[PDB]
């Protein structure tokens, strides 16, 4: 049960940010011509844990990273406000339709470049499956 987890994360993300410009994995996407900010979506696989001794009940861990990129020379205020909104939306313990958020609302340090900066927002999701 790892495809449905990514499907659920995508469903939630489009449920919140359908209209905002965004990038999705392995799809041709061009940045906005106006130079404004756009969202970035990535899915990082974790590890699957065998919990019991009969190797039946398992667990799946995954990491979802959302990054905001904003043009150079335009401050870091609105980017931090957007990151705060992103963190507030993905509250800890939120129940998805396939799983739930194990750990949410984490903001990391800014990565700098001469063409565009980025503030990465990262959280994790978990699902539990019993095999019969």
């Amino acid at each position: 049960m790892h495809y449905e987890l990514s499907a659920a994360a995508r469903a939630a993300f489009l449920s919140k940010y359908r209209d905002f410009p965004h990038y999705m994995e392995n799809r041709n996407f061009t940045p906005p011509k106006d130079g404004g900010m756009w969202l970035r979506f990535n899915y990082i696989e974790g590890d699957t844990l065998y919990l019991s001794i009969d190797r039946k009940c398992k667990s799946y861990i995954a990491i979802v990273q959302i990054g905001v990129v904003f043009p150079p020379g335009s401050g870091v205020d609105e980017a931090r406000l957007k990151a705060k909104e992103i963190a507030d939306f993905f509250k800890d313990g939120k129940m998805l339709n396939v799983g739930y958020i194990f750990e949410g609302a984490i903001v990391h340090q800014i990565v700098k470049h001469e063409s565009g900066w980025m503030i990465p927002v990262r959280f994790t999701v978990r699902v539990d499956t019993k095999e019969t």
Binding site: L51, S52, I53, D54, R55, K56, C57, K130
Partner: protein
């Protein structure tokens, strides 16, 4: 050389009517002259409740051959004669169904270290000891906690009654099947912690000895 991964644990839920055996002969595979076959069949587990033979008491056995008046059991050796005097009566019941514990996290046990008696004689100088009895055996099981799982009421009833219940274990890699009986003890206080699932503790003591049979013999 096998590996205990994939093991499963089953516990008895309901036994059957008492069956009396007049006499049993002593060989590699004992055969009992039962009054009537009753509901016995091929590959059905049975447990003895009382017998003259002190060693073979509360031992879980498996039937091998079923006839109208003769029944065959496997898992216990009766080749010796002095420890198994001829003419001992035998009585047993039949286990109807089994229920399976949910996925089990850890398995552990304590006790069984053999004791020694040390004696020093004035005639000699070196000190020597002899073997003695063994300590009691207690088996501990830990599994995930579920509030509405149907086996909880059964475990509570078994704990309150205090009767002897049979437990079964299956090891796919070794193709074996362990059998024993003991007094059940159930703990229903979840161990709450952070970022790990809470579990409950189940402990069962021992009244008899372990019996090892081949998996293919059962079915």
């Amino acid at each position: 050389m096998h590996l205990p991964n994939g093991a499963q644990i089953f516990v008895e839920t309901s036994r059957g009517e008492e069956i009396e055996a007049t006499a049993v002969t002593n060989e590699k595979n004992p055969v009992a002259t039962v009054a009537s076959k009753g509901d016995l069949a091929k590959g059905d587990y049975v447990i003895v409740t009382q017998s003259t033979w002190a060693k073979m008491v509360s031992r879980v056995l498996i039937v091998t051959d079923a006839q109208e008046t003769s029944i065959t059991l496997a898992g216990i050796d009766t080749s010796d004669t002095l420890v198994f005097p001829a003419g001992g009566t035998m009585s047993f019941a039949k286990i109807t169904g089994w229920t399976e514990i949910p996925c089990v996290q850890e398995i552990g046990q304590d006790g069984g270290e053999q004791q020694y008696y040390t004696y020093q004689c004035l005639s000699d100088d070196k000190e020597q000891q002899i073997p003695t009895f063994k300590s009691a055996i207690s088996l501990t099981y830990t599994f995930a906690h579920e509030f509405d799982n149907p086996i909880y009421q059964i475990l509570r009833k078994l704990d309150s009654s205090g009767q002897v219940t049979a437990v079964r274990m299956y090891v796919p890699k070794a193709s074996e099947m362990r059998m024993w009986a003991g007094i059940l003890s159930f703990n229903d206080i979840p161990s709450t912690q952070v970022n790990e699932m809470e579990t409950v503790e189940l402990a069962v003591s021992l009244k008899g000895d372990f019996t090892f049979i081949s998996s293919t013999l059962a079915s």
